[PDB]
């Protein structure tokens, strides 16, 4: 079999930049090679094929290129809807196989996340489980420290975080930080702080609230 | 317009089979070869077989060879991949893709993929609770409010608001698995705070799997 | 439709193997029927299958 | 193992980009390399320093 060697594994850059990613086949593949976007959750989509091809359609600022066993994927002047993860394929010989895929993310100025926290619902708290959520909204960069404080006992072992696909027009990101309790713990306590240390802030914010208040 | 349509994802228990269907419209799969890729959750794309409708060659990954068998019935124009002895690594979202369409050497159109679950636990719907907008989520004359989905399996839920009339300032987070086995998500929306009670705000919850469809109206407490 | 007689005996392999349940049974048949050129392949996992929940 | 070496790209025109290769420290940090010769084609020769003992490379371009 033939394998395809992508990279980087990751590229960050800023709206604009010119940017290249790579792949290498282990052996020649003479042109069989295409190169796909994927936004998380969709299907791959086509942008260029036989190496150089643009597929119609695509823009004129992606383009390919090939030298011996190296293929070179450009974006000429990165837009922000360009985040999305790029995977080659060789078509030379079956089976067709795919780099491991390089994904591109867009770099931007700081900004500092809005910070909010909601109670568990009386719905939620009718069954015996209480949950918390924080929630970081529209920030940059992603990297954040999310910290739960009940009655000042800092939380461990005892949350999870997700956090959004950067947004298509300006890059941000949000994140939600979920506390799971039980009923009758969380009714043991009454002072819930969410605590968020990022860049954008000059010192981290805490977000609280008292149980029936 | 070009397309391609696969069904028949779902649950299933290891060592059990499965059939998927990907249904072909805007051209004939008797002028291409038909693909299946999958893609594990978090992963990457993984070739899993083809095949060549109008003469019936087929070709397959090693590692689903005597398992998985593709085939394809031209007079419904549409291609099938019958998964049996299912492992947890097949676990992934399938895609259909035509390759060869109008001369076009690599796989110009794919379809929308059906996720395959392979695991021994049970279906399970999800409870819907709302995240009510709040003096503690409001800043700069802008309100946060969603639903909390939690507690279901399998993936996946879909969240929309307003019955998709409402999509600007809507964050759906990515599903966390918990240690209880199952999934949470949140969905949120950014909002005027002066909207608050005289705009209805409603998370439309599907969870196909379970057949669970939930509405669930979010207010102020 | 029609088979020859080395399909007619992968169907009567399965179909007799007593540890496989009745969606794996069907299941292999029906890949039998997709795409016979697979039929040696498709036998031997369904005898690993079999031989597994013994 | 599993490393991820760091790479802060760094064009003659200020112009910054960062990036990440993975795989077994050795195989990494080939690729790095690799990955610099060929952005020297278009950026310019290319120089690279390391820090955190090889896991951590500042590559400028020269124009
Ligand atoms: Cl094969």
């Known amino acids: 079999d033939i394998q395809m060697t992508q990279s980087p594994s990751s590229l960050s850059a800023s709206v604009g930049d010119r940017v290249t990613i790579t792949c290498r086949a282990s052996?020649?593949?003479?042109?069989?090679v295409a190169w796909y976007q994927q936004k998380p959750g969709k299907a791959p989509k086509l942008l260029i094929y036989s190496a150089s091809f643009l597929y119609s359609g695509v823009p004129s600022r992606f383009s390919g290129s090939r030298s011996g066993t190296d293929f070179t994927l450009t974006i000429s002047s990165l837009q922000p809807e360009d985040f999305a993860t790029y995977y080659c394929?060789?078509?030379?010989?079956?089976?067709?196989?795919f780099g491991q895929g390089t994904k591109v993310e867009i770099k931007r100025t700081v900004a500092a996340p809005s910070v909010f926290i909601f109670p568990p619902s009386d719905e939620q708290l009718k069954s015996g489980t209480a949950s918390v959520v924080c929630l970081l909204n529209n920030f940059y960069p992603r990297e954040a420290k999310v910290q739960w404080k009940v009655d000042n006992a800092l939380q461990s072992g005892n949350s999870q975080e997700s956090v959004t696909e950067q947004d298509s027009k300006d890059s941000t990101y949000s994140l939600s930080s979920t506390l799971t309790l039980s009923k009758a713990d969380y009714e043991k306590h009454k002072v819930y702080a969410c605590e968020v240390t990022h860049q954008g802030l000059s010192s981290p914010v805490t977000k609280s609230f008292n149980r029936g208040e | 317009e070009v397309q391609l349509v696969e069904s028949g994802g779902g649950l299933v228990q290891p060592g059990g089979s499965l059939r998927l269907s990907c249904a072909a419209s805007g051209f004939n799969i008797k002028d291409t070869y038909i693909h299946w890729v999958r893609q594990a959750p978090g992963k990457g794309l993984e070739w899993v077989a083809r095949?060549?409708?109008?003469?019936?060659?087929?070709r397959y990954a090693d590692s689903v060879k005597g398992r998985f068998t593709i085939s394809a019935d031209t007079s419904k124009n549409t291609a099938y991949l019958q998964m049996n002895s299912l492992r947890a690594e097949d676990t992934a979202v399938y895609y259909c893709?035509?390759?060869?369409?109008?001369?076009?050497?690599?796989?110009?159109?794919w379809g929308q993929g059906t996720l395959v679950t392979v695991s021994s636990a049970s279906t399970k719907g999800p409870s819907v609770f709302p995240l009510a907008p709040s003096s503690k989520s409001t800043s700069g004359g802008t309100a946060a409010l969603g639903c909390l989905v939690k507690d279901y399996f399998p993936e996946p839920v879909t969240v929309s608001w307003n019955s998709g009339a409402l999509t600007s300032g809507v964050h759906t987070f990515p599903a966390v698995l918990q240690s209880s086995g199952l999934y949470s998500l949140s969905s949120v929306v950014t909002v005027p705070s002066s909207s608050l009670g005289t705009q209805t705000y409603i998370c439309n919850v599907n969870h196909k799997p379970s057949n669970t469809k939930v509405d669930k109206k979010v207010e102020p407490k | 439709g029609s088979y020859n007689k080395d399909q007619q005996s992968a169907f009567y392999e399965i179909l007799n193997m007593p540890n496989l349940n009745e969606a794996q049974r069907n299941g292999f048949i029906q890949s039998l029927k997709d795409d016979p050129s697979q039929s040696t392949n498709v036998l031997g996992e369904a005898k690993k299958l079999n031989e597994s929940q013994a | 193992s599993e490393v991820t070496i760091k790479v802060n790209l760094i064009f003659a025109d200020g112009k910054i980009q960062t990036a990440e290769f993975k795989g077994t420290f050795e195989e990494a940090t080939a690729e790095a390399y690799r990955y610099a010769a060929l952005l020297a084609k278009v950026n310019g020769e290319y120089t690279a320093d390391l820090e955190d003992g090889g896991n951590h490379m500042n590559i400028k371009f020269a124009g």
């Open positions: 893709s035509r390759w060869g369409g109008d001369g076009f050497y690599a796989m110009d159109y």
């Open positions: 052996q020649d593949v003479n042109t069989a």
């Open positions: 394929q060789q078509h030379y010989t079956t089976p067709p196989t």
């Open positions: 095949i060549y409708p109008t003469n019936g060659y087929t």
